[PDB]
Design a protein around this ligand. Structure first.
Ligand SMILES: O=N[O-]
Ligand SMILES: O=N[O-]
Ligand SMILES: O=N[O-]
Ligand SMILES: [Cu+2]
Ligand SMILES: [Cu+2]
Ligand SMILES: [Cu+2]
Ligand SMILES: [Cu+2]
Ligand SMILES: [Cu+2]
Ligand SMILES: [Cu+2]
Lengths: 336, 336, 336
């Protein structure tokens, strides 16, 4: 496409929503290629990641950890206006794994506090992809401070299984998983810092142990539980997009399965089926499609159970509906 | 199927055998759907896991680590009678990744010492699946204390390759891999405790380092070596089921390959082929099919070689038969 | 084939080249099966792996870490003459994951300093496979001292995508990833030794932490960056072979993708497509095919960014050519 052809394409401004929710979209593309516009303001902010009150100086796209999920269709152009407010103290940029060229856009979006930039790229490949900040010389520090999210490039014909059958979800959730490396004092208590830079040296030492102190979903231990638990109903089809920009994860839906899982997150790669626990390598996004068949509470975890239950990588689903005794039944309840 | 139809299905009791061996079964289903009955008694007991007398208070399904492999066919029902003797001290339950609903059966099988329960679930998805204990609030502790195993849900038509050609094995082995986190005193000596609970705090601390003190097959260093090596003969087809309920592993048959490997453990997902080293994520089981071509000793390991040779994740196969010089030959033996 | 028949096959002597380059070869087999000859001298030597002058007592095949890539075609025979100089201090051998029998050849190639051996095996399976030293009792120590490499067994008809379309690369690079475990003194300073054996005890202690002190490409931090960056031009098809003999890795081409990725490293297993970040388990090799579309610098990393940017797992590609504004463009460059 020439500049003239691209300038002639229709444009659509999209309002982002906070994870785990996803902004309104159409699974099957409506019309021809478009330039989909998004705007995100970067916020360096203090966030609490656990019930004890542990703090992290987060570097957050759109003010959240993970950054929001942007949705477009194959061959659409994603045009992101990225803003680094003067209240911030560090330079930031953005690397879209979905993009081609200049370190994913990273080489063209380096903005200092008080600057903004507009990057446009063609979403040539379908799938879910990670996006993350990556300032030369300070790459992992920004990523493990929460500066990452994901986008979904849907095929123009919507999702299909490995054999051509269409797969239409009723709802979609985006679960961003984050590994945090929080310094501790001699009492084993987590430390607090006045400014983000003050935490750098202590944090890098923890990062080098390759052992996170917290592994969480949606930015905090228990963030997707209670009134914030995800929801579904028996018979409902749910797509769960999951990303980890720096470290491996192994998603599992307790009491369920991944009926179709694009473990690599790429739609042209046939999905695995009937999965118990799938694997998403650090630096990637994956997606699982499931039709709930049983009501009740489900846990959704990173299946290194220590990471799930001790470090924080566990969410819940509340599912409404009728119990199916054919699928499962207590023949004899716990008794003497 | 209707209520009467399920109640009318034949019921069959099966005697279990301890890993790495597998109970009597047919690869191709015999007759229509059946309710296959198994019984397992939970045993809390101290076991020695290395050559230094290191102890672990194991929580063992059927008295073994891993728990035994249960085999059924797709759409059969698995009806487990689970017993928790009054001599035990903790509440236990069971979560079948192969099942649908109630946290895999966990929400319906919580039994205190002195209680038993009977759970039935329809094995709707074909493949090998992990099962493990999962008491709310203490999930990883029970799992990393050895309370996990696996089941195999064979397709009613038996196994097939990607082209639909039948794959029939001569023998099957089940290798359960267990990551242990044993506390040490300040002098580096592994600690011993009177009761399981006494070790809880110390153990969780080691678990949080995400660094196991031991990684073993069949419950101990060297359990599947020497006089306990698994066996085969040239020309024999062997299925090796491998599980890891809490942590990633990467199986490798030294001197062989995985001709067909259902790396995700699910039979409707086409098997990878000609594999050197496959990957099984924590929280899942995988299965490899190999036809032996050379006699001699083989090592079967988790290919992070430190885990295999320093931590304990190494087994052996002793294979009989004639050597094939076409496949391999020493043209010039070691000489000065 | 009989001994006589093999004896009558044509023989071709190959001259090996140091990584990341690969020796001359033809993608499509030239003629019928042949006995491809390779010779490698083992060199125990000191290598400096970081800018702090940190030393490792390398055990290097052909004098490099990783050892060089050997290329043959399916059903050719690979005949390796392995030499252990009298100047070396340890026994060494070689295990080809591509081979069948005698522990991959390890049991037939144990050579003391001053000895040599000749091993021949039939390359029956197509793909990239790891090869590494494995002396009984000291297996991981030699592997994490850099004694590993890989070989590529090309289909006789060259590479093809999942549907049969031929995939022909213009260039090929071999990236060997190495996890190193360097002991430190009380002040956190890396220790130096005057003999491989002297560091054994101290190194095993670090190895047991399963936490490498360094993770590098081609033997050292920066080995494949700056001036030693790999090169290509817009429009060129490049195959990147990557191996890790002991620990998992997750390759990512920053600003690009893996158009076709044989993540398991095996050619009869259809490749995944449109990959952002792929996964290679320790003990295996993988291969990605990509056609460059944008010029500029590309980072190629292990996407656990701490491993890439703190521990050393990062390489560069320098690509020439014209920028494509359709694929990506800076609508508004960084500005106030
Ligand atoms: O899904 N927790 O075992
Ligand atoms: O399978 N040992 O490298
Ligand atoms: O691919 N570097 O984030
Ligand atoms: Cu940033
Ligand atoms: Cu990246
Ligand atoms: Cu239990
Ligand atoms: Cu589970
Ligand atoms: Cu060696
Ligand atoms: Cu090996």
């Amino acid at each position: 496409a020439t500049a003239a052809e691209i300038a002639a394409l229709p444009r659509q401004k999209v309002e982002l929503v906070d994870p785990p929710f996803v902004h309104a979209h159409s699974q099957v593309a409506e019309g021809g290629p478009k330039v989909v516009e998004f705007t995100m303001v970067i916020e360096e902010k203090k966030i609490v990641i656990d019930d004890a009150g542990t703090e992290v100086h987060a570097m957050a796209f759109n003010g959240t950890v993970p950054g929001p999920l942007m949705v477009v269709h194959q061959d659409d152009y994603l045009e992101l206006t990225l803003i680094n407010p003067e209240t911030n103290t560090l330079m930031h940029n953005i690397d879209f794994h979905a993009a081609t060229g200049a370190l994913g856009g990273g080489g063209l979006t380096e903005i200092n506090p008080g600057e903004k930039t507009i990057l446009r790229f063609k979403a040539t490949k379908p799938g879910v992809f990670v996006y993350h900040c990556a300032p030369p010389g300070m790459v992992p520090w920004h990523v493990v401070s929460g500066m990452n999210g994901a986008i979904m490039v849907l095929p123009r014909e919507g999702l299909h299984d490995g054999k051509g059958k269409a797969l239409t979800y009723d709802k979609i959730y985006y679960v961003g998983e984050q590994d945090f490396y929080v310094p501790r004092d001699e009492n084993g208590k987590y430390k607090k810092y006045e400014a983000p830079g003050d935490a750098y040296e202590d944090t890098v030492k923890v990062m080098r142990t390759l052992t996170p102190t917290h592994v969480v979903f949606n930015g905090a231990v228990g963030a997707l539980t209670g009134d914030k638990a995800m929801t579904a109903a028996v018979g409902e089809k749910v797509l769960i997009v999951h990303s980890q920009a720096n470290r491996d994860t192994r998603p599992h839906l307790t009491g369920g399965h991944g009926d179709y899982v694009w473990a690599t997150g790429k739609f042209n790669t046939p999905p695995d089926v009937d999965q118990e626990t799938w694997f998403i390598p650090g630096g990637a996004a994956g997606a699982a499609f499931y039709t709930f068949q049983q009501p009740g509470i489900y846990a959704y975890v990173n299946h290194n159970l220590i990471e799930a239950f001790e470090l924080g990588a566990a969410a819940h689903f509340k599912v409404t509906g009728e119990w199916n005794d054919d699928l499962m039944t207590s023949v004899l309840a716990p008794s003497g």
